[PDB]
Amino acid sequence: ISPAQIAEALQGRGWDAEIVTDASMAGQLVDVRPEGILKCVDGRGSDNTRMGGPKMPGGIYAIAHNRGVTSIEGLKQITKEVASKGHLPSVHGDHSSDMLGCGFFKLWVTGRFDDMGYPRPQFDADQGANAVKDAGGIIEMHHGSHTEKVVYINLLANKTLEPNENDQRFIVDGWAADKFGLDVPKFLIAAAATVEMLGGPKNAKIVVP
Numbered sequence: 001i002s003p004a005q006i007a008e009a010l011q012g013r014g015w016d017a018e019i020v021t022d023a024s025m026a027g028q029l030v031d032v033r034p035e036g037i038l039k040c041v042d043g044r045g046s047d048n049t050r051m052g053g054p055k056m057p058g059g060i061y062a063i064a065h066n067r068g069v070t071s072i073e074g075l076k077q078i079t080k081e082v083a084s085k086g087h088l089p090s091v092h093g094d095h096s097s098d099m100l101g102c103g104f105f106k107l108w109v110t111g112r113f114d115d116m117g118y119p120r121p122q123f124d125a126d127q128g129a130n131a132v133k134d135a136g137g138i139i140e141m142h143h144g145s146h147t148e149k150v151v152y153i154n155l156l157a158n159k160t161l162e163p164n165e166n167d168q169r170f171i172v173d174g175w176a177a178d179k180f181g182l183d184v185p186k187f188l189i190a191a192a193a194t195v196e197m198l199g200g201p202k203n204a205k206i207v208v209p
Helices: 003-012 061-067 072-084 103-109 125-134 174-179 184-197
Strands: 016-021 088-094 138-142 151-154 170-173 203-208
Touching (some): 003 016, 003 184, 061 103, 061 184, 072 088, 072 125, 088 125, 103 184, 151 174, 151 184, 170 184, 174 184
Parallel strands (some): 016 203, 088 138, 151 170, 151 203
């Protein structure tokens, strides 16, 4: 899917979308490092000490969700898969709602994706976090409130953007979906629906090389 197709798809859902250059993001783009956790698009600050990893909704839950994987065994398999592909796998909570502090997972476990054709997870938030931890993953915990003002959809392979708790943004590394063989259009639409259902801003900037 091309940057223009992504913008068109988002505009079809009532979003404002614009394509921007990698040069316009100078000073913010960073190379992905193997030590970084593949983590959520959440714009808040957190206890993360493993920066420089890719961003996907709910961390590795985006992969399970896109593939319709709902079992604890399947979640552990994905944890090890991510660890085998150059990133430390993670899921997260926050210090306001504990493991229900991940908006994406809360939407999934409460059935908000039902009519988009997604099956529900066969575990709750605490069980999922414990399984990821048991399989070698990291549990991140955010703090503060959501104040995201924009959604960046980064298409530059092996690069990412980092959270700024003081001028927040949702960050989606679209290129990472391709890396994991996901149904990409489905992944991006799920990301869009997530932001919509969380009341976030339907305003996207698509970063291209």
